[PDB]
C-alpha cells in the first residue's frame, strides 16, 4: 504494498 | 499478377478504346476482336494488346 518505495524515508509526511 | 492490362483500339479512326487483361507469357500474339464502336455506331475490328 500500500504505502511502499519508502514516504519521508520512514517518517511519513515530513516537510517543514 | 502475371496478367497485364491492355487496350483494344478502334480501327475506325476514332479514339474509342476498350480495356482488358492478357497473359503475355502464354499468348504472345495480338488480340483482335470485332467490337461495337459507339462513335461511328457500328461493329468494327479492334486490335492491339498495348
Amino acid at each position: 504494498x500500500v504505502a511502499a518505495x519508502x514516504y519521508x524515508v520512514x517518517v511519513x509526511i515530513x516537510x517543514x | 499478377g502475371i496478367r497485364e492490362k491492355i487496350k483494344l483500339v478502334s480501327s475506325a479512326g476514332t479514339g474509342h478504346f476498350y480495356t482488358t487483361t492478357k497473359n503475355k507469357r502464354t499468348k504472345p500474339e495480338k488480340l483482335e476482336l470485332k467490337k461495337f464502336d459507339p462513335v461511328v455506331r457500328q461493329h468494327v475490328i479492334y486490335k492491339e494488346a498495348k
Binding site: - | 492490362k5 480495356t19 482488358t20 487483361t21
Partner: protein, 64 residues
C-alpha cells in the same frame, strides 16, 4: 463575425430546387478495367444526398 463556409464541401455539393443537395458518385476515378460497364454506367449520373447525411451537409454550407 460572419460564418465561414467549409470550402471543401462547397466543391462537392450543389443545392437543388426543393432544398436538397446533388453530388457526384464515388468509385469512378481509377481502377476501372476490373469494374463492369453496368456498374460504371450507373455511377456516372449525379445523385441526391440521403436524409441521414443532410444535417452534416447543411452545417458545412451555411450560405448554400
Amino acid at each position: 463575425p460572419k460564418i465561414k463556409t467549409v470550402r471543401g464541401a462547397a466543391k462537392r455539393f450543389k443545392k437543388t430546387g426543393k432544398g436538397g443537395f446533388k453530388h457526384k458518385h464515388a468509385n469512378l476515378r481509377h481502377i476501372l478495367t476490373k469494374k463492369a460497364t453496368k456498374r460504371k454506367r450507373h455511377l456516372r449520373p449525379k445523385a441526391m444526398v440521403s436524409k441521414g447525411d443532410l444535417g452534416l451537409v447543411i452545417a458545412c454550407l451555411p450560405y448554400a
